[PDB]
Amino acid sequence: SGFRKMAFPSGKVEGCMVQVTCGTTTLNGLWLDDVVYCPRHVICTSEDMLNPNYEDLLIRKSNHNFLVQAGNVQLRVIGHSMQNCVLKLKVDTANPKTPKYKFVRIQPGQTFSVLACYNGSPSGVYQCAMRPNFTIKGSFLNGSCGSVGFNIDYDCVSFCYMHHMELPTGVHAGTDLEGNFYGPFVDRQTAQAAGTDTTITVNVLAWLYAAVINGDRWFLNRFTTTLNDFNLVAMKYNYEPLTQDHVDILGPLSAQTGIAVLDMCASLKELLQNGMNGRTILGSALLEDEFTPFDVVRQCSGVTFQ
Amino acid sequence: SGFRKMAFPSGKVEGCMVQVTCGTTTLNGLWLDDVVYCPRHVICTSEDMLNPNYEDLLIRKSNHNFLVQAGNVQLRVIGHSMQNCVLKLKVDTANPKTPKYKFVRIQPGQTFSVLACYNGSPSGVYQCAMRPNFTIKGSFLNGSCGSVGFNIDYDCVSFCYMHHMELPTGVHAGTDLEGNFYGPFVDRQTAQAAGTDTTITVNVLAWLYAAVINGDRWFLNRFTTTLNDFNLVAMKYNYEPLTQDHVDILGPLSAQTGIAVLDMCASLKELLQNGMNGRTILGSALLEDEFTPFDVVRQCSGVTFQ
Numbered sequence: 001s002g003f004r005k006m007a008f009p010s011g012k013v014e015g016c017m018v019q020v021t022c023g024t025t026t027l028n029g030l031w032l033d034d035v036v037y038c039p040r041h042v043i044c045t046s047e048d049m050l051n052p053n054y055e056d057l058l059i060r061k062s063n064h065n066f067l068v069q070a071g072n073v074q075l076r077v078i079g080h081s082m083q084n085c086v087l088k089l090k091v092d093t094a095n096p097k098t099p100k101y102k103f104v105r106i107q108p109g110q111t112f113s114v115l116a117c118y119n120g121s122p123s124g125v126y127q128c129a130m131r132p133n134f135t136i137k138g139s140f141l142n143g144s145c146g147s148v149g150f151n152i153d154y155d156c157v158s159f160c161y162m163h164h165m166e167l168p169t170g171v172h173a174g175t176d177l178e179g180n181f182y183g184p185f186v187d188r189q190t191a192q193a194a195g196t197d198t199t200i201t202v203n204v205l206a207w208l209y210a211a212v213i214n215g216d217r218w219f220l221n222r223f224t225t226t227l228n229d230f231n232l233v234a235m236k237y238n239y240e241p242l243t244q245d246h247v248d249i250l251g252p253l254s255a256q257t258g259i260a261v262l263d264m265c266a267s268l269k270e271l272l273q274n275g276m277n278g279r280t281i282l283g284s285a286l287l288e289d290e291f292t293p294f295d296v297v298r299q300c301s302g303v304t305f306q
Numbered sequence: 307s308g309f310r311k312m313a314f315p316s317g318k319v320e321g322c323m324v325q326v327t328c329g330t331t332t333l334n335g336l337w338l339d340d341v342v343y344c345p346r347h348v349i350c351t352s353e354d355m356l357n358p359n360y361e362d363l364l365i366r367k368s369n370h371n372f373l374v375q376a377g378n379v380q381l382r383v384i385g386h387s388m389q390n391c392v393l394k395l396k397v398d399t400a401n402p403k404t405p406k407y408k409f410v411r412i413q414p415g416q417t418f419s420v421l422a423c424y425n426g427s428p429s430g431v432y433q434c435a436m437r438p439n440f441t442i443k444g445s446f447l448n449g450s451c452g453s454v455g456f457n458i459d460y461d462c463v464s465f466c467y468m469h470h471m472e473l474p475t476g477v478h479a480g481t482d483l484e485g486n487f488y489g490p491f492v493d494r495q496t497a498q499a500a501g502t503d504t505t506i507t508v509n510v511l512a513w514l515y516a517a518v519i520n521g522d523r524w525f526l527n528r529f530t531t532t533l534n535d536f537n538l539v540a541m542k543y544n545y546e547p548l549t550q551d552h553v554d555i556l557g558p559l560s561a562q563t564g565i566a567v568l569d570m571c572a573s574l575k576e577l578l579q580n581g582m583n584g585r586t587i588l589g590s591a592l593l594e595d596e597f598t599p600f601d602v603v604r605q606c607s608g609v610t611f612q
């Protein structure tokens with residue numbers, strides 16, 4: 001038992017991290033087979049930051065403008081191209097530690113692990129969720145660009161995020177690995193702001209199920225509600241509305257605890273109206289929304305990976 | 307910026323995890339050079355659980371009673387011995403992925419990363435603290451025994467914890483890698499309970515410094531206190547007392563924020579007496595005590611590892 005903010009083991013990703021330098025700018029790249037992927041803003045200088053023309057900046061570069069280092073070994077850049085907001089650097093050597101991988105775009109509310117890196121060197125791993133406003137609440141310092149987010153599905157690493165920038169509110173924005181931004185953000189140093197965030201309701205419910213599994217039961221009651229009555233209260237508190245699809249997703253947790261989803265929704269409705277009254281749930285005094293139903297099952301039932 | 311519960315990258319440890327079977331019992335082992343380390347209770351059956359005589363149980367075994375698998379490859383056990391509460395299995399092949407390592411015993415209040423494993427397969431990584439009562443609040447299911455805790459110091463993995471059991475309150479207990487238990491626990495299925503826990507004060511202060519660095523300032527004030535006046539209030543709230551050594555440890559964070567430790571202590575004293583009043587600090591509504599001063603510096607300044 002117990003319940004922690006748990007990330008995926010990062011070994012398979014650590015072997016893909018490289019350092020990319022172009023000019024006076026160094027950041028992180030992702031080396032899979034013979035391609036290194038990195039944010040295209042590595043080719044900007046201080047003059048182009050505010051309004052870069054990336055096609056112009058890239059035409060003015062040659063392969064030898066790009067220094068790629070995998071620890072000590074130097075990788076020779078033999079070609080380069082741009083795919084949306086990522087740069088693809090073709091190198092002379094295929095990464096022998098390339099795992100089975102795919103590129104996937106995730107949806108708001110889903111979680112992934114972040115391998116924070118500096119100078120091509122992995123520094124830490126942590127778990128976060130894609131927020132409904134398409135930002136993540138990450139932990140990143142100067143030099144972290146090109147760090148990646150990923151899930152592990154059996155033996156296969158699913159890359160879903162590459163880090164590009166920090167917004168003024170301290171939250172983070174980036175792209176999928178095909179270079180398409182999450183959210184309405186652009187890779188230029190203008191003043192952009194995230195839209196208003198909401199709480200991920202299906203995730204709060206999954207976490208309450210995790211609490212019941214771990215012996216936290218004080219918030220339960222024998223009332224039941226309907227989808228439409230619950231969604232009416234949720235809207236007032238800036239909670240995402242609950243769909244029948246969400247109810248089905250919560251099936252395994254309802255089955256294992258014998259508490260129906262709409263029963264659990266009645267508990268959540270009370271918590272939103274009366275608060276917690278100085279009581280905690282799984283060691284938190286706030287309702288937690290960064291665990292998916294799958295995260296809970298994985299941690300309260302125990303799937304491994306190859 | 308930002309602040310997350312961040313673990314060390316686990317790659318260097320993942321390559322050391324093996325599966326150990328003896329009889330109908332399978333659990334995890336740690337393979338370094340030509341020795342596999344695992345909890346000695348792998349040699350118990352249901353009859354010996356309540357009061358095992360480990361010297362008797364071990365004499366009745368031969369090398370071929372122990373099945374060790376590193377994924378698919380079978381490792382041949384050519385010798386075995388007991389060191390306190392761990393079993394040391396000598397095998398025919400030295401682990402080619404052995405990192406630079408050492409065995410260290412940590413103190414209450416220090417943090418480490420846990421690589422939770424099942425059947426020799428790494429499942430997740432998370433960060434926790436050794437509590438003052440020598441337990442950890444882990445996340446572990448059936449089959450997790452032999453999972454290890456570790457820190458990374460530059461290029462060197464410092465192993466500090468091997469998982470042995472879950473106590474009745476849902477918290478976890480284990481040994482250092484020389485087999486000596488943390489706390490007054492024994493590897494037998496008697497009813498043992500952890501003593502009362504306290505809050506790790508120096509860690510709460512470090513976290514308040516992390517908050518200031520990330521722009522959370524609402525709890526500050528211009529009062530100052532003394533060590534002895536603060537410790538008087540802390541005792542009443544089940545907080546560990548604060549030593550001059552703790553003050554010195556917090557030096558770098560005082561320097562970077564320009565707020566003296568005893569100034570910060572005056573803020574903490576107010577938070578303990580008036581509560582949080584529905585305000586949060588770094589996204590928490592409770593005071594967090596599982597980040598050391600070193601964790602904060604590492605995350606709010608940015609050390610990598612080789």
Ligand SMILES: O=C(c1cc(=O)[nH]c(=O)[nH]1)N1CCN(c2cc(Cl)c(Cl)c(Cl)c2)CC1
Pocket residue numbers: 041044045049052140141142143144145164165166172186187188189307
């Ligand atoms: O390393 C960080 C960083 C990341 C983070 O998450 N937090 C943080 O404090 N610093 N940089 C800030 C973003 N920088 C940048 C540069 C250009 Cl030229 C463009 Cl065009 C754009 Cl969009 C962004 C690169 C450097």
Ligand SMILES: O=C(c1cc(=O)[nH]c(=O)[nH]1)N1CCN(c2cc(Cl)c(Cl)c(Cl)c2)CC1
Pocket residue numbers: 001347350351355358446447448449450451470471472478492493494495
């Ligand atoms: O896998 C887990 C486990 C770990 C955990 O953290 N949580 C959890 O639910 N289960 N086991 C419980 C402890 N078991 C055991 C067996 C013997 Cl024979 C002795 Cl003597 C002792 Cl001390 C302990 C081994 C199996």
